[PDB]
Amino acid sequence: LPNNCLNASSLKCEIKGISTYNVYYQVENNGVIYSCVSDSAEGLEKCDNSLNLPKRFSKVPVIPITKLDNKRHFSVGTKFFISESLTQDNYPITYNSYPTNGTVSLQTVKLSGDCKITKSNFANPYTVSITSPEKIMGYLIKKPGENVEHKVISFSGSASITFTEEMLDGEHNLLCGDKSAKIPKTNKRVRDCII
Amino acid sequence: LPNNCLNASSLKCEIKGISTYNVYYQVENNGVIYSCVSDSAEGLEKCDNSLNLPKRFSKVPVIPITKLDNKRHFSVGTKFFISESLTQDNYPITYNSYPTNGTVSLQTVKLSGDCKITKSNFANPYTVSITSPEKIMGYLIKKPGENVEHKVISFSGSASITFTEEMLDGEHNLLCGDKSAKIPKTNKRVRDCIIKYSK
Ligand SMILES: *[C@@H]1O[C@H](CO)[C@@H](O[C@@H]2O[C@H](CO)[C@@H](O)[C@H](O)[C@H]2NC(C)=O)[C@H](O)[C@H]1NC(C)=O
Ligand SMILES: *[C@@H]1O[C@H](CO)[C@@H](O[C@@H]2O[C@H](CO)[C@@H](O)[C@H](O)[C@H]2NC(C)=O)[C@H](O)[C@H]1NC(C)=O
Ligand SMILES: *[C@@H]1O[C@H](CO)[C@@H](O[C@@H]2O[C@H](CO)[C@@H](O)[C@H](O)[C@H]2NC(C)=O)[C@H](O)[C@H]1NC(C)=O
Ligand SMILES: *[C@@H]1O[C@H](CO)[C@@H](O[C@@H]2O[C@H](CO)[C@@H](O)[C@H](O)[C@H]2NC(C)=O)[C@H](O)[C@H]1NC(C)=O
Numbered sequence: 001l002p003n004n005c006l007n008a009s010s011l012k013c014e015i016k017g018i019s020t021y022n023v024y025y026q027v028e029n030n031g032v033i034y035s036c037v038s039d040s041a042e043g044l045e046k047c048d049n050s051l052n053l054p055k056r057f058s059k060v061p062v063i064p065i066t067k068l069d070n071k072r073h074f075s076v077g078t079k080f081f082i083s084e085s086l087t088q089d090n091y092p093i094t095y096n097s098y099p100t101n102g103t104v105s106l107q108t109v110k111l112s113g114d115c116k117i118t119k120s121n122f123a124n125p126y127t128v129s130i131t132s133p134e135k136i137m138g139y140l141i142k143k144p145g146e147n148v149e150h151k152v153i154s155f156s157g158s159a160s161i162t163f164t165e166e167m168l169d170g171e172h173n174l175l176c177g178d179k180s181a182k183i184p185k186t187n188k189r190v191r192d193c194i195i
Numbered sequence: 196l197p198n199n200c201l202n203a204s205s206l207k208c209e210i211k212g213i214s215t216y217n218v219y220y221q222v223e224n225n226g227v228i229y230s231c232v233s234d235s236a237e238g239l240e241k242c243d244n245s246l247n248l249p250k251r252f253s254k255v256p257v258i259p260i261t262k263l264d265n266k267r268h269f270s271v272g273t274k275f276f277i278s279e280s281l282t283q284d285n286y287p288i289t290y291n292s293y294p295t296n297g298t299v300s301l302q303t304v305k306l307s308g309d310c311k312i313t314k315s316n317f318a319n320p321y322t323v324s325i326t327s328p329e330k331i332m333g334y335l336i337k338k339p340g341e342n343v344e345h346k347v348i349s350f351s352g353s354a355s356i357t358f359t360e361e362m363l364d365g366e367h368n369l370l371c372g373d374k375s376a377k378i379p380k381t382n383k384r385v386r387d388c389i390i391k392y393s394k
Binding site for chain 2: 016017024063064066068069078081082083084085086095098100104105106107108
């Protein structure tokens with residue numbers, strides 16, 4: 001019964017770690033430290049070392065990056081996941097209110113889900129549509145290397161994106177989940193022209 | 196520099212852990228320990244604890260399981276991956292001979308890739324075919340919650356999977372990459388009849 005973790009305001013707790021999309025905390029109760037990870041940020045506002053805890057965690061679908069090449073081009077932050085311990089000392093954790101045993105590890109993250117970057121946008125070639133079936137789905141335009149941790153945008157059923165004059169250089173990328181599409185370099189003149 | 200790792204044979208290498216799909220080892224060149232993770236066990240035969248090393252670690256594409264409900268249905272073994280340490284102290288390891296920074300983390304992994312399954316021509320009614328665009332691809336029929344390790348079959352391009360009596364119970368799932376399919380209960384004797392007399 002991991003109910004100790006969902007009511008952390010009542011008890012003593014330590015924020016053991018804050019990622020981009022979730023938080024690692026342990027609460028102390030009955031003399032028994034209970035370790036936990038959640039997406040909420042709610043009722044942990046009083047915990048030790050909670051100061052930087054954001055108001056809200058994004059809650060878009062994301063998975064860990066497995067190919068190290070891809071970090072630069074696809075990284076969209078960090079998040080905690082339940083791994084298993086190298087020593088046989090696995091201790092029980094609660095992940096988003098699911099009970100398990102394991103060890104917590106932080107891991108750099110790429111966007112996941114099913115999204116549709118529609119390359120043909122004829123009505124205005126600089127207003128592009130994005131459509132996904134998922135309840136919630138996330139996009140982000142990212143030159144490879146830029147720190148864009150909290151710059152992700154969540155769009156639910158469908159969306160439409162107009163590129164800023166800044167982003168139009170050849171090296172930016174429209175990441176929307178498992179999909180990824182290179183943004184072409186618009187000439188110095190033409191860019192000023194359109195606006 | 197991975198150069199020190201990839202030359203396992205020479206140095207005092209200590210196998211520090213074996214997983215279903217890769218191995219964690221650290222070697223020793225002139226007083227500095229280099230932790231490493233590798234997707235094949237060439238070399239390392241004399242390494243300190245090579246006793247349990249597969250001859251081949253499978254190279255089928257797998258990613259880590261994030262939604263922990265799936266684990267029961269999708270398990271397909273465990274693989275080392277590289278993570279960033281919770282404490283600020285991340286150290287240098289080489290992961291499949293790429294130098295980078297972090298900490299070694301072990302996770303339970305599901306199959307990933309592209310393969311599709313509905314297949315063939317109303318024939319070999321107990322056989323279906325799996326086709327995949329990628330170079331290598333994995334499949335595995337797993338009753339949810341089975342002990343499967345190095346039970347995963349590497350196939351390229353195409354394969355045809357002829358079910359058995361056991362699989363045809365209403366409980367086994369055909370795991371192939373990103374897909375799963377449920378194998379339903381057949382009338383065993385209808386099958387039994389067919390296998391018996393037909394060509
Ligand atoms: C704070 O802790 C108590 C102690 O567990 C929780 O009481 C549980 O309430 C949940 C309902 O959400 C039930 O599943 C359990 O039957 C209760 N367990 C008990 C009484 O031991 C309480 O609910 C927690 N706070 C919140 C908001 O759920
Ligand atoms: C981790 O959680 C599991 C889940 O209960 C504990 O594993 C044992 O699981 C069996 C089967 O459900 C039970 O019969 C045992 O009573 C469980 N053991 C205990 C102590 O509850 C496991 O022990 C937990 N803790 C660890 C592994 O340190
Ligand atoms: C494996 O490690 C050893 C280090 O002890 C390397 O040994 C020497 O490398 C030099 C060139 O760097 C050669 O000229 C020698 O013939 C090697 N042997 C000895 C006994 O000194 C060896 O080259 C390494 N193998 C690699 C890097 O592939
Ligand atoms: C792994 O991280 C360490 C730091 O934890 C790196 O050491 C840094 O090296 C860069 C460039 O060589 C310097 O700018 C930093 O000042 C160093 N930091 C410290 C704390 O010494 C190390 O280079 C990293 N390893 C790799 C392979 O990138």
